[PDB]
Amino acid sequence: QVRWKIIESYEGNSYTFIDPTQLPYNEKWEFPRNNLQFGKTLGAGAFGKVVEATAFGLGKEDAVLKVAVKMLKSTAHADEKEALMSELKIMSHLGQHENIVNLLGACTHGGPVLVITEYCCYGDLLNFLRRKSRVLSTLSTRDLLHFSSQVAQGMAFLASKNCIHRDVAARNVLLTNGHVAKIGDFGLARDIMNDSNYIVKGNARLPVKWMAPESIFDCVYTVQSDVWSYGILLWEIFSLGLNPYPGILVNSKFYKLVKDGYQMAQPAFAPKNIYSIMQACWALEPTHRPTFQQICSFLQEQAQEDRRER
Ligand SMILES: C[C@@H]1CN(c2ccc(Nc3ncc4c(=O)c(C(N)=O)cn(-c5ccc6c(c5)CCC6)c4n3)cc2)C[C@H](C)N1
Protein backbone atom coordinates (compact mmCIF):
# COMPACT_ATOMS: atom_id res chain seq x y z
CA GLN A 1 0.00 0.00 0.00
CA VAL A 2 1.05 3.61 -0.59
CA ARG A 3 -0.88 5.54 2.09
CA TRP A 4 0.27 6.59 5.57
CA LYS A 5 -0.34 4.19 8.45
CA ILE A 6 -0.11 4.35 12.24
CA ILE A 7 1.57 1.29 13.76
CA GLU A 8 1.96 -0.10 17.27
CA SER A 9 5.37 0.12 18.94
CA TYR A 10 6.32 -1.48 22.26
CA GLU A 11 9.28 -0.46 24.39
CA GLY A 12 9.97 2.01 21.62
CA ASN A 13 10.28 5.71 22.42
CA SER A 14 6.68 6.42 21.43
CA TYR A 15 3.51 4.55 22.37
CA THR A 16 0.28 4.18 20.40
CA PHE A 17 -2.66 4.43 22.81
CA ILE A 18 -5.30 4.86 20.13
CA ASP A 19 -5.88 4.05 16.48
CA PRO A 20 -7.05 7.36 14.90
CA THR A 21 -9.06 5.45 12.30
CA GLN A 22 -11.30 4.68 15.26
CA LEU A 23 -12.77 7.44 17.40
CA PRO A 24 -13.93 9.37 14.30
CA TYR A 25 -13.68 13.00 13.17
CA ASN A 26 -13.31 15.93 15.56
CA GLU A 27 -15.81 18.52 14.33
CA LYS A 28 -13.39 21.26 15.40
CA TRP A 29 -11.90 21.14 11.89
CA GLU A 30 -15.25 21.85 10.26
CA PHE A 31 -15.13 24.74 7.80
CA PRO A 32 -17.91 26.40 5.76
CA ARG A 33 -17.86 24.81 2.32
CA ASN A 34 -19.35 27.97 0.81
CA ASN A 35 -16.27 29.92 1.95
CA LEU A 36 -14.18 27.88 -0.50
CA GLN A 37 -13.66 29.12 -4.06
CA PHE A 38 -12.26 26.36 -6.28
CA GLY A 39 -9.45 26.83 -8.77
CA LYS A 40 -7.36 24.54 -10.97
CA THR A 41 -6.97 20.80 -10.44
CA LEU A 42 -3.45 20.20 -9.13
CA GLY A 43 -3.47 16.44 -9.52
CA ALA A 44 -5.70 13.39 -9.48
CA GLY A 45 -5.66 9.61 -9.16
CA ALA A 46 -8.24 6.88 -9.73
CA PHE A 47 -10.50 7.64 -6.77
CA GLY A 48 -9.85 11.27 -5.90
CA LYS A 49 -8.26 14.58 -6.80
CA VAL A 50 -6.60 17.59 -5.22
CA VAL A 51 -7.61 21.07 -6.35
CA GLU A 52 -6.29 24.53 -5.50
CA ALA A 53 -8.74 26.93 -3.87
CA THR A 54 -9.03 30.25 -2.09
CA ALA A 55 -10.39 29.93 1.45
CA PHE A 56 -12.01 32.93 3.13
CA GLY A 57 -11.87 33.33 6.90
CA LEU A 58 -9.89 30.19 7.73
CA GLY A 59 -8.45 29.51 11.16
CA LYS A 60 -7.80 31.61 14.26
CA GLU A 61 -6.48 34.46 12.11
CA ASP A 62 -9.28 33.70 9.64
CA ALA A 63 -7.08 34.90 6.80
CA VAL A 64 -7.84 34.63 3.09
CA LEU A 65 -5.29 32.26 1.58
CA LYS A 66 -4.60 29.68 -1.11
CA VAL A 67 -5.24 26.16 0.13
CA ALA A 68 -5.28 22.68 -1.36
CA VAL A 69 -8.55 20.75 -1.19
CA LYS A 70 -8.80 16.98 -1.54
CA MET A 71 -12.06 15.30 -2.60
CA LEU A 72 -13.44 12.14 -4.22
CA LYS A 73 -14.29 11.53 -7.87
CA SER A 74 -17.62 10.21 -9.16
CA THR A 75 -16.23 6.66 -9.42
CA ALA A 76 -15.79 6.73 -5.64
CA HIS A 77 -17.99 4.43 -3.56
CA ALA A 78 -18.29 3.81 0.18
CA ASP A 79 -14.86 2.21 0.45
CA GLU A 80 -13.34 5.37 -1.03
CA LYS A 81 -15.22 7.69 1.34
CA GLU A 82 -13.93 5.73 4.34
CA ALA A 83 -10.31 5.87 3.20
CA LEU A 84 -10.57 9.65 2.73
CA MET A 85 -12.07 10.10 6.20
CA SER A 86 -9.35 7.76 7.48
CA GLU A 87 -6.72 10.02 5.90
CA LEU A 88 -8.47 12.98 7.52
CA LYS A 89 -8.48 11.23 10.89
CA ILE A 90 -4.73 10.56 10.76
CA MET A 91 -3.77 14.13 9.88
CA SER A 92 -5.94 15.46 12.71
CA HIS A 93 -4.27 13.06 15.16
CA LEU A 94 -0.66 13.63 14.09
CA GLY A 95 -0.57 17.30 14.96
CA GLN A 96 1.42 20.00 13.19
CA HIS A 97 5.01 20.15 11.98
CA GLU A 98 6.89 22.60 9.78
CA ASN A 99 7.90 19.96 7.22
CA ILE A 100 4.52 18.29 6.86
CA VAL A 101 1.65 19.53 4.70
CA ASN A 102 -0.65 20.46 7.58
CA LEU A 103 -4.39 19.96 7.99
CA LEU A 104 -6.21 23.32 8.00
CA GLY A 105 -9.83 22.17 8.06
CA ALA A 106 -12.49 19.96 6.52
CA CYS A 107 -16.00 19.97 5.08
CA THR A 108 -17.77 16.77 6.09
CA HIS A 109 -21.34 18.09 6.18
CA GLY A 110 -23.65 19.68 3.64
CA GLY A 111 -22.00 17.95 0.70
CA PRO A 112 -19.08 15.73 -0.41
CA VAL A 113 -16.17 15.36 2.01
CA LEU A 114 -13.48 17.98 1.42
CA VAL A 115 -10.09 17.96 3.16
CA ILE A 116 -8.29 21.30 3.36
CA THR A 117 -4.48 21.44 3.65
CA GLU A 118 -1.72 24.02 3.16
CA TYR A 119 -0.99 24.93 -0.46
CA CYS A 120 2.63 24.47 -1.56
CA CYS A 121 3.19 27.03 -4.28
CA TYR A 122 6.28 25.59 -6.01
CA GLY A 123 4.98 22.09 -6.69
CA ASP A 124 6.99 18.89 -6.42
CA LEU A 125 10.70 18.64 -5.65
CA LEU A 126 11.51 16.28 -8.52
CA ASN A 127 10.31 18.72 -11.18
CA PHE A 128 12.08 21.60 -9.41
CA LEU A 129 15.35 19.67 -9.44
CA ARG A 130 15.08 18.73 -13.11
CA ARG A 131 14.31 22.33 -14.08
CA LYS A 132 17.25 23.69 -12.07
CA SER A 133 19.44 21.04 -13.66
CA ARG A 134 19.10 22.61 -17.11
CA VAL A 135 19.04 26.39 -16.64
CA LEU A 136 21.74 28.68 -18.09
CA SER A 137 19.97 31.10 -9.59
CA THR A 138 21.63 27.68 -9.65
CA LEU A 139 21.29 25.28 -6.71
CA SER A 140 24.19 24.93 -4.28
CA THR A 141 25.13 22.17 -1.86
CA ARG A 142 23.51 24.19 0.93
CA ASP A 143 20.15 24.12 -0.87
CA LEU A 144 20.38 20.37 -1.47
CA LEU A 145 21.35 19.91 2.19
CA HIS A 146 18.36 21.98 3.30
CA PHE A 147 15.95 19.86 1.29
CA SER A 148 17.54 16.71 2.73
CA SER A 149 17.28 18.02 6.31
CA GLN A 150 13.74 19.33 6.01
CA VAL A 151 12.47 15.99 4.71
CA ALA A 152 14.49 14.16 7.37
CA GLN A 153 12.81 16.28 10.08
CA GLY A 154 9.39 15.58 8.62
CA MET A 155 10.16 11.87 8.66
CA ALA A 156 11.66 11.99 12.17
CA PHE A 157 8.34 13.56 13.21
CA LEU A 158 6.32 10.77 11.59
CA ALA A 159 8.58 8.17 13.20
CA SER A 160 7.96 9.81 16.59
CA LYS A 161 4.24 9.23 16.04
CA ASN A 162 4.67 5.62 14.97
CA CYS A 163 3.51 6.68 11.50
CA ILE A 164 4.95 5.10 8.35
CA HIS A 165 4.89 6.88 5.00
CA ARG A 166 5.44 4.09 2.47
CA ASP A 167 6.04 6.26 -0.61
CA VAL A 168 9.06 8.46 0.14
CA ALA A 169 10.38 9.93 -3.12
CA ALA A 170 11.23 13.29 -4.66
CA ARG A 171 7.98 13.24 -6.65
CA ASN A 172 6.31 13.13 -3.23
CA VAL A 173 8.05 16.12 -1.68
CA LEU A 174 6.46 19.55 -2.16
CA LEU A 175 8.11 22.98 -1.95
CA THR A 176 6.24 25.88 -0.38
CA ASN A 177 7.17 29.50 0.42
CA GLY A 178 10.91 29.92 0.83
CA HIS A 179 11.26 26.63 -1.03
CA VAL A 180 10.79 24.81 2.27
CA ALA A 181 10.16 21.09 1.66
CA LYS A 182 7.04 19.39 2.99
CA ILE A 183 5.83 15.79 2.89
CA GLY A 184 2.30 14.44 3.11
CA ASP A 185 0.03 11.60 2.08
CA PHE A 186 -0.33 12.47 -1.60
CA GLY A 187 -1.71 9.24 -3.03
CA LEU A 188 -5.06 10.72 -4.07
CA ALA A 189 -3.31 13.45 -6.03
CA ARG A 190 -1.07 10.86 -7.69
CA ASP A 191 -2.15 9.47 -11.05
CA ILE A 192 -0.48 6.17 -10.13
CA MET A 193 -2.07 4.37 -13.08
CA ASN A 194 -0.29 6.64 -15.54
CA ASP A 195 3.08 6.86 -13.79
CA SER A 196 5.33 4.04 -15.01
CA ASN A 197 7.40 4.24 -11.82
CA TYR A 198 4.56 2.32 -10.17
CA ILE A 199 4.95 -1.28 -11.32
CA VAL A 200 1.97 -3.61 -11.57
CA LYS A 201 2.30 -6.38 -9.01
CA GLY A 202 -0.84 -8.37 -9.70
CA ASN A 203 -3.41 -6.22 -7.93
CA ALA A 204 -1.22 -3.33 -6.80
CA ARG A 205 1.08 -0.70 -8.27
CA LEU A 206 4.25 -0.21 -6.29
CA PRO A 207 7.23 2.18 -6.57
CA VAL A 208 9.64 -0.75 -6.87
CA LYS A 209 12.81 1.31 -7.36
CA TRP A 210 12.21 3.18 -4.08
CA MET A 211 11.29 0.20 -1.89
CA ALA A 212 13.39 -1.65 0.68
CA PRO A 213 13.97 -5.32 -0.22
CA GLU A 214 11.94 -6.47 2.80
CA SER A 215 9.01 -4.36 1.60
CA ILE A 216 9.35 -5.81 -1.90
CA PHE A 217 9.97 -9.39 -0.83
CA ASP A 218 8.03 -9.75 2.43
CA CYS A 219 5.57 -6.85 2.17
CA VAL A 220 7.06 -5.62 5.44
CA TYR A 221 6.67 -1.88 6.02
CA THR A 222 8.42 -0.18 8.94
CA VAL A 223 10.13 3.09 9.80
CA GLN A 224 13.30 1.30 8.69
CA SER A 225 11.88 0.60 5.24
CA ASP A 226 10.99 4.30 5.02
CA VAL A 227 14.65 4.97 5.82
CA TRP A 228 15.70 2.96 2.75
CA SER A 229 13.36 4.98 0.53
CA TYR A 230 14.71 8.19 2.05
CA GLY A 231 18.15 7.07 0.87
CA ILE A 232 16.80 6.73 -2.66
CA LEU A 233 15.32 10.21 -2.30
CA LEU A 234 18.78 11.47 -1.28
CA TRP A 235 20.21 10.00 -4.46
CA GLU A 236 17.50 11.81 -6.44
CA ILE A 237 18.26 15.14 -4.77
CA PHE A 238 22.04 14.98 -5.24
CA SER A 239 21.72 13.79 -8.84
CA LEU A 240 19.33 16.69 -9.45
CA GLY A 241 16.53 14.29 -10.23
CA LEU A 242 17.77 11.35 -12.28
CA ASN A 243 15.54 8.26 -12.31
CA PRO A 244 17.01 5.74 -9.83
CA TYR A 245 19.05 2.80 -11.14
CA PRO A 246 19.56 4.62 -14.46
CA GLY A 247 19.09 2.48 -17.55
CA ILE A 248 18.23 -0.54 -15.40
CA LEU A 249 14.78 -1.93 -16.22
CA VAL A 250 12.53 -3.31 -13.50
CA ASN A 251 12.53 -7.04 -14.17
CA SER A 252 13.65 -10.20 -12.41
CA LYS A 253 17.26 -9.11 -12.84
CA PHE A 254 16.57 -5.88 -10.96
CA TYR A 255 15.19 -7.81 -7.97
CA LYS A 256 18.18 -10.17 -7.79
CA LEU A 257 20.55 -7.19 -7.79
CA VAL A 258 18.95 -5.35 -4.88
CA LYS A 259 18.44 -8.67 -3.11
CA ASP A 260 22.16 -9.34 -3.56
CA GLY A 261 23.25 -5.94 -2.27
CA TYR A 262 23.58 -3.79 -5.38
CA GLN A 263 23.70 -0.04 -4.65
CA MET A 264 23.62 2.98 -6.97
CA ALA A 265 26.87 4.83 -7.62
CA GLN A 266 27.56 8.18 -5.94
CA PRO A 267 25.59 11.02 -7.65
CA ALA A 268 27.43 13.93 -9.24
CA PHE A 269 26.64 16.47 -6.52
CA ALA A 270 26.81 14.34 -3.37
CA PRO A 271 29.85 14.89 -1.16
CA LYS A 272 31.28 11.63 0.14
CA ASN A 273 29.65 12.22 3.53
CA ILE A 274 26.18 12.47 2.01
CA TYR A 275 26.79 9.32 -0.05
CA SER A 276 27.67 7.57 3.23
CA ILE A 277 24.15 8.42 4.43
CA MET A 278 22.75 6.76 1.31
CA GLN A 279 24.83 3.63 1.92
CA ALA A 280 23.75 3.49 5.57
CA CYS A 281 20.11 3.82 4.42
CA TRP A 282 20.61 0.90 2.04
CA ALA A 283 21.93 -1.57 4.60
CA LEU A 284 20.30 -4.93 3.84
CA GLU A 285 19.76 -5.54 7.55
CA PRO A 286 17.03 -3.04 8.60
CA THR A 287 18.34 -2.66 12.16
CA HIS A 288 21.71 -1.57 10.76
CA ARG A 289 19.99 1.42 9.15
CA PRO A 290 20.21 4.82 10.86
CA THR A 291 17.20 6.45 12.48
CA PHE A 292 15.75 9.62 11.00
CA GLN A 293 16.89 11.51 14.09
CA GLN A 294 20.46 10.28 13.59
CA ILE A 295 20.22 11.37 9.95
CA CYS A 296 18.96 14.79 11.04
CA SER A 297 21.84 15.09 13.51
CA PHE A 298 24.48 14.12 10.93
CA LEU A 299 23.00 16.37 8.22
CA GLN A 300 23.08 19.19 10.76
CA GLU A 301 26.86 18.72 11.01
CA GLN A 302 27.25 18.73 7.21
CA ALA A 303 25.35 22.03 7.05
CA GLN A 304 27.57 23.75 9.63
CA GLU A 305 30.72 22.58 7.84
CA ASP A 306 29.33 24.09 4.62
CA ARG A 307 28.49 27.26 6.53
CA ARG A 308 32.06 27.40 7.82
CA GLU A 309 34.03 26.73 4.63
CA ARG A 310 31.59 28.27 2.15
C1 LIG B 1 1.27 19.83 -13.23
C2 LIG B 1 1.83 20.97 -12.38
C3 LIG B 1 1.57 20.70 -10.86
N1 LIG B 1 2.15 21.82 -10.07
C4 LIG B 1 1.82 21.84 -8.70
C5 LIG B 1 1.47 20.68 -7.92
C6 LIG B 1 1.15 20.78 -6.53
C7 LIG B 1 1.16 22.03 -5.85
N2 LIG B 1 0.84 22.23 -4.50
C8 LIG B 1 0.27 21.46 -3.51
N3 LIG B 1 -0.03 21.95 -2.29
C9 LIG B 1 -0.62 21.11 -1.39
C10 LIG B 1 -0.93 19.78 -1.67
C11 LIG B 1 -1.57 18.87 -0.69
O1 LIG B 1 -1.86 19.29 0.43
C12 LIG B 1 -1.85 17.45 -1.12
C13 LIG B 1 -2.48 16.40 -0.26
N4 LIG B 1 -2.82 16.78 1.01
O2 LIG B 1 -2.69 15.26 -0.66
C14 LIG B 1 -1.49 17.11 -2.38
N5 LIG B 1 -0.87 17.95 -3.33
C15 LIG B 1 -0.52 17.42 -4.63
C16 LIG B 1 -1.21 17.82 -5.83
C17 LIG B 1 -0.84 17.29 -7.10
C18 LIG B 1 0.22 16.36 -7.17
C19 LIG B 1 0.91 15.95 -6.00
C20 LIG B 1 0.56 16.47 -4.74
C21 LIG B 1 1.99 14.97 -6.33
C22 LIG B 1 1.57 14.51 -7.75
C23 LIG B 1 0.78 15.68 -8.38
C24 LIG B 1 -0.59 19.33 -2.96
N6 LIG B 1 0.00 20.18 -3.85
C25 LIG B 1 1.50 23.18 -6.61
C26 LIG B 1 1.82 23.09 -7.99
C27 LIG B 1 3.61 21.98 -10.31
C28 LIG B 1 3.85 22.24 -11.82
C29 LIG B 1 5.34 22.39 -12.11
N7 LIG B 1 3.29 21.12 -12.66
Side-chain angles (χ1 to χ4, degrees):
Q1 186 51 75
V2 176
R3 62 210 182 194
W4 291 13
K5 180 161 182 286
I6 304 293
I7 58 172
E8 303 151 12
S9 173
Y10 303 112
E11 296 190 307
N13 293 130
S14 300
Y15 192 95
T16 300
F17 288 97
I18 55 184
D19 200 66
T21 301
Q22 292 51 56
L23 292 55
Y25 171 61
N26 183 340
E27 300 276 334
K28 66 178 186 172
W29 293 108
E30 197 58 31
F31 177 78
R33 170 186 319 269
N34 194 211
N35 292 341
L36 243 37
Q37 178 183 50
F38 286 136
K40 76 187 92 166
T41 293
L42 299 171
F47 318 107
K49 65 180 166 187
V50 173
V51 309
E52 193 186 0
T54 302
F56 306 88
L58 177 159
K60 287 189 169 187
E61 306 297 304
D62 52 67
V64 170
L65 76 176
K66 296 291 192 186
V67 300
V69 184
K70 176 174 303 157
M71 69 196 72
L72 295 179
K73 287 186 184 171
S74 310
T75 307
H77 303 301
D79 288 5
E80 282 78 77
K81 290 182 185 50
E82 293 191 32
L84 179 51
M85 287 296 315
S86 203
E87 188 167 352
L88 205 208
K89 283 163 182 179
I90 292 181
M91 300 306 316
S92 58
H93 181 252
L94 278 180
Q96 292 193 319
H97 190 271
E98 53 191 338
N99 302 115
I100 289 195
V101 181
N102 296 289
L103 179 65
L104 300 184
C107 311
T108 61
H109 306 300
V113 174
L114 311 177
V115 184
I116 308 167
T117 50
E118 307 171 320
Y119 175 65
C120 297
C121 63
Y122 294 119
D124 62 292
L125 169 56
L126 178 59
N127 178 250
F128 175 81
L129 288 171
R130 295 177 164 180
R131 270 0 101 192
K132 285 302 205 176
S133 179
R134 46 184 121 202
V135 291
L136 180 62
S137 70
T138 299
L139 285 172
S140 290
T141 173
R142 61 173 163 155
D143 302 303
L144 300 184
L145 291 176
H146 285 338
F147 294 150
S148 301
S149 287
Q150 288 161 353
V151 171
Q153 328 245 31
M155 294 301 299
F157 177 78
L158 293 187
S160 74
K161 302 297 187 168
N162 293 341
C163 185
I164 60 174
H165 182 302
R166 294 200 290 190
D167 201 3
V168 175
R171 66 184 171 265
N172 278 329
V173 175
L174 279 38
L175 304 176
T176 185
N177 296 258
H179 286 80
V180 178
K182 285 171 173 284
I183 57 180
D185 190 343
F186 299 149
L188 280 183
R190 170 83 46 207
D191 187 346
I192 293 172
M193 300 287 274
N194 293 314
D195 182 346
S196 55
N197 288 118
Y198 293 78
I199 309 305
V200 183
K201 178 178 186 181
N203 192 279
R205 288 177 153 77
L206 304 169
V208 162
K209 287 202 172 180
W210 283 259
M211 298 170 57
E214 70 262 25
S215 302
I216 295 174
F217 301 150
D218 301 345
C219 294
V220 177
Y221 287 105
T222 69
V223 177
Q224 284 63 53
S225 62
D226 278 344
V227 168
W228 174 288
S229 298
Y230 176 85
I232 299 300
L233 159 65
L234 275 186
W235 187 90
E236 294 182 276
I237 292 179
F238 289 89
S239 68
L240 297 187
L242 298 174
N243 189 242
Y245 303 95
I248 303 184
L249 286 179
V250 177
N251 57 29
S252 295
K253 301 179 181 183
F254 172 80
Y255 297 112
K256 293 184 186 67
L257 286 177
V258 302
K259 185 188 186 82
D260 296 349
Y262 180 75
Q263 297 180 0
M264 288 187 276
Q266 185 172 2
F269 307 103
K272 178 69 164 170
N273 286 348
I274 296 305
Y275 186 54
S276 296
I277 300 180
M278 296 184 205
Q279 295 172 304
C281 288
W282 300 330
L284 287 180
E285 171 50 41
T287 56
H288 284 199
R289 301 185 189 143
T291 65
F292 283 114
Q293 187 49 53
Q294 290 175 330
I295 290 176
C296 287
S297 174
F298 189 67
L299 282 169
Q300 197 172 278
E301 299 174 21
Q302 304 318 123
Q304 290 178 21
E305 182 61 90
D306 170 78
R307 178 198 165 192
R308 203 191 87 77
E309 297 182 283
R310 153 259 152 198

